[PDB]
Design a protein around this ligand. Structure first.
Ligand SMILES: [Ca+2]
Length: 223
């Protein structure tokens, strides 16, 4: 997250870190056994880390649970990142508590202009590299479809939305991929892609989770 703030330990209790020997992507806990992330975060051998603040210190509220299964969307296209969503099943249910908690899936799609909370352990520099140890947060508004298509001509599908600031300076970034975009208390986006981070006229692009609720529900009813 570039231009964000330190969230505060466990104030984003549905945020997970995906670890393959190191943090590589975020995700969102949607119930005690399942995490939503981006399909471009797929790796074999994923451990889900819940209850994290500092990803480099064991502070006492973590649960580390191996994934048993990962399910990339059946229509994921890694070239265009259309349908950039994945489900990850935990080998054992998380113990839900004040610091490890699920986020609701949406009933309705979020509105343009809504300010959402985006979080993660990704790079904090627009130019260069610096990865934080503690979770960062950003409030960013959803942009209109026509603004998002003007920013990325011939690249935005109906399963993507843009959020952020066209002036630059505030965005999600590498290492935040797969993490949540929460709007009015529901998981509405997944950190997916963008041209650089926090560059002028190049806002973040996010997977539109409200288009996938039927898939998520039928997949979790079957696995
Ligand atoms: Ca920790």
């Amino acid at each position: 997250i570039v231009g964000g703030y330190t969230c505060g330990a466990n104030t984003v209790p549905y945020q997970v870190s995906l670890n393959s020997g190191y943090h590589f992507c975020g995700g969102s806990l949607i119930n005690s056994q399942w995490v939503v992330s981006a399909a471009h975060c797929y790796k074999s051998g994923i451990q889900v880390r819940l209850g994290e603040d500092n990803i480099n210190v064991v502070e006492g509220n973590e649960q580390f649970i191996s994934a048993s299964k990962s399910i990339v969307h059946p229509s994921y296209n890694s070239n265009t990142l259309n349908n950039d969503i994945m489900l990850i099943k935990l080998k054992s249910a998380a113990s839900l508590n004040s610091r490890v908690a699920s986020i609701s899936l949406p009933t309705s799609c979020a509105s343009a202009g809504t300010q959402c909370l985006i979080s993660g352990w990704g790079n904090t520099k627009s130019s260069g590299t610096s990865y934080p140890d503690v979770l960062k947060c950003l409030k960013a508004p959803i942009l209109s479809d026509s603004s998002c298509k003007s920013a990325y001509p011939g690249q935005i599908t109906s399963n993507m939305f843009c959020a952020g600031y066209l002036e630059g300076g505030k965005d999600s970034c590498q290492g935040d991929s797969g993490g949540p975009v929460v709007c009015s208390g529901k998981l509405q986006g997944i950190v997916s892609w963008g041209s650089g981070c926090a560059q002028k006229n190049k806002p973040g692009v996010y997977t539109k989770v409200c288009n996938y609720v039927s898939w998520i529900k039928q997949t979790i009813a079957s696995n």
